[PDB]
Amino acid sequence: QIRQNYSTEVEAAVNRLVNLYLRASYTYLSLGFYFDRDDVALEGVCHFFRELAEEKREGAERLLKMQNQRGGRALFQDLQKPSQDEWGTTLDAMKAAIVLEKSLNQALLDLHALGSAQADPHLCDFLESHFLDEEVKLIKKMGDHLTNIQRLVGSQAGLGEYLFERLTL
Amino acid sequence: QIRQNYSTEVEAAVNRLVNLYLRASYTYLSLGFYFDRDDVALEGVCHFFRELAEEKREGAERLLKMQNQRGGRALFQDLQKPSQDEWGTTLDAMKAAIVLEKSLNQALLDLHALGSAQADPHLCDFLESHFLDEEVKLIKKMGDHLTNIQRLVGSQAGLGEYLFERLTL
Amino acid sequence: QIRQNYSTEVEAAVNRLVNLYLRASYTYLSLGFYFDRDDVALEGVCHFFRELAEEKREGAERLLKMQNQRGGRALFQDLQKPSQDEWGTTLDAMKAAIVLEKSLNQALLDLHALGSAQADPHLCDFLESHFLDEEVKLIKKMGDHLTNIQRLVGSQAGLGEYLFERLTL
Amino acid sequence: QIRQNYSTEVEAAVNRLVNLYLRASYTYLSLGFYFDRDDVALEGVCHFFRELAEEKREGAERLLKMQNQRGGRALFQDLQKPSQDEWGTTLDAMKAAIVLEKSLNQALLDLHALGSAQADPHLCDFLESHFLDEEVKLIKKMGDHLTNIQRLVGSQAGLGEYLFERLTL
Ligand SMILES: [Cl-]
Ligand SMILES: [Cl-]
Ligand SMILES: [Cl-]
Ligand SMILES: [Cl-]
Ligand SMILES: [Fe+3]
Ligand SMILES: [Fe+3]
Ligand SMILES: [Fe+3]
Ligand SMILES: [Fe+3]
Ligand SMILES: [Fe+3]
Ligand SMILES: [Fe+3]
Ligand SMILES: [Fe+3]
Ligand SMILES: [Fe+3]
Ligand SMILES: [Fe+3]
Ligand SMILES: [Fe+3]
Ligand SMILES: [Fe+3]
Ligand SMILES: [Fe+3]
Ligand SMILES: [Fe+3]
Ligand SMILES: [Fe+3]
Ligand SMILES: [Fe+3]
Ligand SMILES: [Fe+3]
Ligand SMILES: [Fe+3]
Ligand SMILES: [Fe+3]
Ligand SMILES: [Fe+3]
Ligand SMILES: [Fe+3]
Ligand SMILES: [Fe+3]
Ligand SMILES: [Fe+3]
Ligand SMILES: [Fe+3]
Ligand SMILES: [Fe+3]
Ligand SMILES: [Fe+3]
Ligand SMILES: [Fe+3]
Ligand SMILES: [Fe+3]
Ligand SMILES: [Fe+3]
Ligand SMILES: [Fe+3]
Ligand SMILES: [Fe+3]
Ligand SMILES: [Fe+3]
Ligand SMILES: [Fe+3]
Ligand SMILES: [Fe+3]
Ligand SMILES: [Fe+3]
Ligand SMILES: [Fe+3]
Ligand SMILES: [Fe+3]
Ligand SMILES: [Fe+3]
Ligand SMILES: [Fe+3]
Ligand SMILES: [Fe+3]
Ligand SMILES: [Fe+3]
Ligand SMILES: [Fe+3]
Ligand SMILES: [Fe+3]
Ligand SMILES: [Fe+3]
Ligand SMILES: [Fe+3]
Ligand SMILES: [Fe+3]
Ligand SMILES: [Fe+3]
Ligand SMILES: [Fe+3]
Ligand SMILES: [Fe+3]
Ligand SMILES: [Fe+3]
Ligand SMILES: [Fe+3]
Ligand SMILES: [Fe+3]
Ligand SMILES: [Fe+3]
Ligand SMILES: [Fe+3]
Ligand SMILES: [Fe+3]
Ligand SMILES: [Fe+3]
Ligand SMILES: [Fe+3]
Ligand SMILES: [Fe+3]
Ligand SMILES: [Fe+3]
Ligand SMILES: [O]
Ligand SMILES: [O]
Ligand SMILES: [O]
Ligand SMILES: [O]
Ligand SMILES: [O]
Ligand SMILES: [O]
Ligand SMILES: [O]
Ligand SMILES: [O]
Ligand SMILES: [O]
Ligand SMILES: [O]
Ligand SMILES: [O]
Ligand SMILES: [O]
Ligand SMILES: [O]
Ligand SMILES: [O]
Ligand SMILES: [O]
Ligand SMILES: [O]
């Protein structure tokens, strides 16, 4: 058929990466709707996480497309529910988001390493081009948000969270 | 004439609901002008309540129109003056506004129940379509405002009320 | 707070309905990528199911929004993986899609019944307005597709599936 | 001069790759004109292969440009005539086209490997950027075409080839 230079080890890892991105999308959907609760009511934070839910879903879709293009076979698994039901303050959430992104980034790096070992340059380039750069930029932006939240919620935590939501997000 | 499947019990309750919406409109007019006092001076809060005064008056007008359309007879009663002359802080006012809206909502639910009991689907649909959805959305928005006011007026109440008025309303 | 006339029984059922719509979205994502396999290669069928994946996800999002608006609390569960890894012919898939939609429709009808029993007209109207009508139209369209697939794959099944994909989808 | 980190082994392989792409261009020109014969008369298939002849020629031209940019020296060899004079059915041709593309792809992978061994990242990136991705997409598209041709020419081969040409190409 069309499959060429596409190992079963890479195929399986791409399937696992699809699951991790859909899991992340689901986490962001839960973060977003938590900040839209009447008793939380931070619309800018809700909007930030809803946008990330969409981006992670797009990530998954491009991986699946790539899997089909190389002749691998997509296999879906159960998607685990997010690690929490309530996500605390904006500070707590942005910390949980950075931890999540770093674990996706690490999965991307692990797949790139596997691609290198297997001499699969198309895999390596596809990750380089569509995932690694974007993760780095996103992680930087979250770290920046995290620094600003912290400087704000030193004293007067309520006031600080409100101003962050209104003036940054 | 035109009257069909329109009970006297529904007619009377529609008249009472008109009175409650005009009463609410009047309450909002008083809230709005209180926040426009030189010694209160929160223009965004004034504008929010003036807009609600207009919406409640529109509500009353659509009920009256519907009463005429079904062949019932509008009857007006005295409109009671608002429960207060001065409305305290933005926090106090938004609490009084939520209590008001919930009491309108309850009146709408009571009328819907009566409509169901009387087998009056046109009544049920007219409420569904023009009132119940809008009340729910409004109550959510007020609850959100209330949460943000509270998080702001934890410490530094004056500063918090000013920032809410400037950045949310 | 804002919660009014919103039973715990309805809240829980809304949470379960969110899970069913996300489960359906996931099923459609798997149907879509299966038809994009190089060894299946029916782009119109892929596009039809990808669009349904998006619609079901939108469905879930509106339910969550509504849950927040009424003051209920969203709770997410694990999303079960689709019932199959490979979906056979266009005929087999469209049959599996109709069965899925009818099971969503039945869940919507069950929730509407519960809403009626609980005297929750806002719930009843929200379903009426955004879900019941759309499900009916979609089920009709799938039944139409199914009839046309069947008339085509009487004799010359390969030729029939190709023509359906090219001239209908 | 300008030559830096550009091995004679890479230079020679780039020259061989230029020859393979021009050879492929020539094969596609012959495929295209065969389908334009009065006794074959499949215009859409002719147009598909003529477009591929142009793409492969562009491929060769970019390699030559790159050779000049790195300071290597282009050397041309005789271009071998296509492996066949007549190419049979649309099915036979699309099979021969996939085999051709996979042999170009393999040559690209071999050059990338050599580039890696020689620590020549500019070479590796130039291939990544302009050739490897495009080959993968093209091979997927040909595999899709091949699947659709096969499902069509099950029964009624003449009818199937005509419909493919008219509705896909
Ligand atoms: Cl291979
Ligand atoms: Cl009557
Ligand atoms: Cl209640
Ligand atoms: Cl050198
Ligand atoms: Fe909102
Ligand atoms: Fe977006
Ligand atoms: Fe968007
Ligand atoms: Fe958006
Ligand atoms: Fe995006
Ligand atoms: Fe986006
Ligand atoms: Fe992006
Ligand atoms: Fe997008
Ligand atoms: Fe994008
Ligand atoms: Fe594709
Ligand atoms: Fe919880
Ligand atoms: Fe909860
Ligand atoms: Fe690389
Ligand atoms: Fe930045
Ligand atoms: Fe003014
Ligand atoms: Fe207005
Ligand atoms: Fe106005
Ligand atoms: Fe106005
Ligand atoms: Fe209005
Ligand atoms: Fe208005
Ligand atoms: Fe309105
Ligand atoms: Fe108006
Ligand atoms: Fe209006
Ligand atoms: Fe009239
Ligand atoms: Fe007074
Ligand atoms: Fe006074
Ligand atoms: Fe109803
Ligand atoms: Fe809101
Ligand atoms: Fe495609
Ligand atoms: Fe769409
Ligand atoms: Fe779309
Ligand atoms: Fe689309
Ligand atoms: Fe939609
Ligand atoms: Fe859509
Ligand atoms: Fe829709
Ligand atoms: Fe849409
Ligand atoms: Fe829509
Ligand atoms: Fe909202
Ligand atoms: Fe399977
Ligand atoms: Fe499979
Ligand atoms: Fe109803
Ligand atoms: Fe209704
Ligand atoms: Fe139709
Ligand atoms: Fe011609
Ligand atoms: Fe061209
Ligand atoms: Fe051209
Ligand atoms: Fe052209
Ligand atoms: Fe080109
Ligand atoms: Fe071109
Ligand atoms: Fe190109
Ligand atoms: Fe061109
Ligand atoms: Fe080009
Ligand atoms: Fe130059
Ligand atoms: Fe010959
Ligand atoms: Fe000949
Ligand atoms: Fe590389
Ligand atoms: Fe690279
Ligand atoms: Fe394709
Ligand atoms: O909201
Ligand atoms: O978005
Ligand atoms: O996106
Ligand atoms: O994206
Ligand atoms: O004012
Ligand atoms: O207004
Ligand atoms: O209005
Ligand atoms: O309105
Ligand atoms: O595709
Ligand atoms: O779409
Ligand atoms: O949609
Ligand atoms: O929709
Ligand atoms: O032609
Ligand atoms: O072309
Ligand atoms: O091209
Ligand atoms: O190209």
How many CB contacts within 8 angstroms connect chain C with chain D? 44
**Which residues have beta carbons under 5 A from ligand 6 (an ion)?**
A 51
* Cβ atoms of residues C166 and C92 within 8 Å: no
Rounded Cα distance between C28 and C20, Å, is: 12
Q: Which of B110, B121, B100 is nearest to B31 (CA)?
A: B100
- The tokens describing A140, both together, are 């930087």
Helix (H, G, I), strand (E, B) or coil at D168: coil
Touch between chain A and chain C: 3 or more Cβ pairs under 8 Å: yes
Strand partners, C79: A79
* Cβ atoms of residues C49 and C94 within 8 Å: no
Q: What is the dihedral of CA C26, C27, C32, C33, to 10 degrees?
A: 70
Rounded Cα distance between D81 and D26, Å, is: 7
- The tokens describing D114, both together, are 């050599």
Q: Which of D166, D168, D167 is nearest to D42 (CA)?
A: D166
Residue A28, classified by CB atoms within 10 Å of its CB into exposed (0-12), middle (13-18) or buried (19+), is buried
- The tokens describing D25, both together, are 């261009």
- Nearest CA-CA distance, residue B37 and chain C, Å: 29
Note the maximum CA span of chain C: 64
Rounded Cα distance between A29 and B63, Å, is: 39
Q: At CB < 8 Å, which residues of chain B contact A?
A: 140, 143-145, 147-148, 150-152, 154-156, 159-160, 163-164, 167-168
* A169 CA → ligand 66 middle, Å: 19
Rounded Cα distance between C124 and B125, Å, is: 11
Q: Which of A84, A88, A72, A105 is nearest to A30 (CA)?
A: A84
Is C55 known to sit in a ligand binding site? yes
Residues contacting ligand 77 via CB (< 6 Å): D 54-55, 58
Tokens 């689901």, residue? A26
SS3 content of chain D, % helix, strand, coil (to 5): 75, 0, 25
Handedness of CA B107, B111, B113, B114 (dihedral sign): positive
Rounded Cα distance between C135 and B106, Å, is: 31
What is B1-169's CATH topology? Ferritin (1.20.1260)
Q: Where are the domains of chain B?
A: 1-169
Is B43 known to sit in a ligand binding site? no
Rounded Cα distance between A165 and C27, Å, is: 36
Contact A158 B147 (CB under 8 A): no
Name the resolution in angstroms.
2.0
DSSP state of B4: -
Rounded Cα distance between B73 and B67, Å, is: 7
Which of B136, B137, B146 is the best substitution to test chain C (most C C-beta atoms within 10 A)? B136
Q: Output the CA angle D51-D97-A64, nearest 5 degrees.
A: 90
Contact B156 A161 (CB under 8 A): no
Residues across chain A: 169
- For chain A, give the secondary structure using H, E and C: CCCCCCCHHHHHHHHHHHHHHHHHHHHHHHHHHHHCCCCCCCHHHHHHHHHHHHHHHHHHHHHHHHHHHCCCCCCCCCECCCCCCCCCCHHHHHHHHHHHHHHHHHHHHHHHHHHHHCCCHHHHHHHHHHHHHHHHHHHHHHHHHHHHHHHHCCCCHHHHHHHHHHHCC
Rounded Cα distance between B93 and B169, Å, is: 14
Rounded Cα distance between C39 and D145, Å, is: 10
Instruction: Tell how far CA B53 is from the center of its chain.
Output: 8
Tokens 């023509």, residue? C163
Contact D133 A124 (CB under 8 A): no
Q: What is the dihedral of CA C115, C121, C122, C127, to 10 degrees?
A: 60
Which of A153, A155, A159 is the best substitution to test chain B (most B C-beta atoms within 10 A)? A159
Q: Name, in order, each residue with C-beta under 8 angstroms of D8's C-beta and a sequence gap of 6 or more.
A: none
Handedness of CA D161, D163, D164, D166 (dihedral sign): positive
Is A54 known to sit in a ligand binding site? yes
Q: Output the CA angle C28-C33-C35, nearest 5 degrees.
A: 100
Residues across chain B: 169
Mutual orientation of helices B43-69 and B157-167 as an angle, nearest 10°?
A: 50
